[PDB]
Design a protein around this ligand. Structure first.
Ligand SMILES: [Zn+2]
Ligand SMILES: [Zn+2]
Length: 314
């Protein structure tokens, strides 16, 4: 019997040799949990070679390849039976969201229904915003110390994006026994990709934001038979994952839409099948609410101005 580490290393080198990954990346690879670049280079090479015309939608090329890298990593670890405790390789979870089950109703990461709020932007009036229940007494889009950090300026549009992912999954897995109600989502962007990253404030998992597919109705549904595609036609908004705390502490350019995230997983399974004859078991952890994902709030009073020189009359 051989150590799991050596068995992993062999498989990974076979891949890196076959896909002509850079020599330094090859030399330095040690199957360690933060070593994802060489595996992403495998995937990008396979894409360049087999899928040059792949169309991404609200996903950056870098983020798509990085996620394939993590999934490839997870399959290699599973194949070899190597696990590093506290380094789950995908950086993702399956959230049983229940956001497309009841008309007009969204649930947050807590699994509780989201409360309706009016949200005024600048002047735009969003009277259909939704907040985490633990934020129900906060201004719209401000987060309490008990928040999960989820907020939708537009609840109807959010529900369209959840219907879209659920339909996309039903089209890819029309005979699924299980999983059509789960969302594959990232738990880590670049900012918390390492378990000992410096603590940061604000949201503790990648933000989830629905984006409209705005030309998608100028489309003739009758011409399209791809059920995947029809998911977007019927529900023209995508869930898009970005940095834990995107800029409009740390921030990064992580950006991937839910269908492209599932396709990153699916395309790794294809790549794997072209190199190995069985696909190992690989479990993306089911999401469970816990305090580690709680928003890290800091509430600082800010003095309003007063024309007076002195605080008080005496
Ligand atoms: Zn919540
Ligand atoms: Zn980030």
């Amino acid at each position: 019997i051989v150590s799991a580490w050596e068995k992993g290393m062999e498989a990974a080198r076979a891949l890196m040799d076959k896909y002509h990954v850079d020599n330094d990346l090859k030399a330095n690879f040690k199957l360690l949990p933060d070593q994802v670049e060489a595996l992403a280079a495998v995937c990008k090479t396979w894409l360049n070679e087999e899928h040059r015309g792949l169309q991404l939608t609200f996903t950056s090329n870098k983020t798509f390849v990085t996620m394939m890298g993590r999934f490839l990593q997870a399959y290699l670890q599973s194949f070899a039976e190597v696990t590093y405790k506290h380094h789950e390789p995908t950086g993702c979870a399956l959230w049983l969201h229940r956001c497309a089950e009841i008309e007009g109703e969204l649930k947050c990461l807590h699994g509780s229904i989201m409360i309706n709020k009016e949200h005024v932007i600048e002047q735009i009036s969003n009277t259909d915003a939704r907040c985490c229940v633990h934020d129900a007494a906060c201004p719209a889009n401000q987060f309490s110390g008990k928040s999960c950090g989820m907020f939708f300026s537009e609840g109807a549009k959010a529900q369209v994006a959840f219907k879209q992912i659920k339909a996309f999954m039903q089209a890819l897995y029309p005979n699924a026994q299980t999983g059509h109600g789960h969302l594959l989502m990232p738990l880590r962007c670049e900012c918390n990709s390492k378990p000992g990253h410096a603590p940061f404030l604000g949201r503790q998992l990648p933000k989830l934001t629905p984006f409209a597919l705005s030309n998608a109705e100028d489309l003739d549904a009758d011409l399209i038979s791809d059920k995947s595609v029809l998911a977007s036609v019927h529900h023209p908004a995508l869930i898009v994952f970005q940095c834990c705390n995107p800029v409009y502490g740390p921030n990064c350019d992580f950006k991937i839409s839910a269908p492209d995230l599932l396709n990153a997983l699916v395309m790794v399974r294809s790549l794997w099948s072209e190199n190995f004859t069985e696909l190992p078991r690989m479990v993306v952890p089911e999401f469970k609410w816990s305090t580690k994902h709680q928003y890290r709030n800091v509430s600082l009073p800010v003095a309003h101005s007063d024309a007076r020189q002195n605080p008080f009359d005496f």
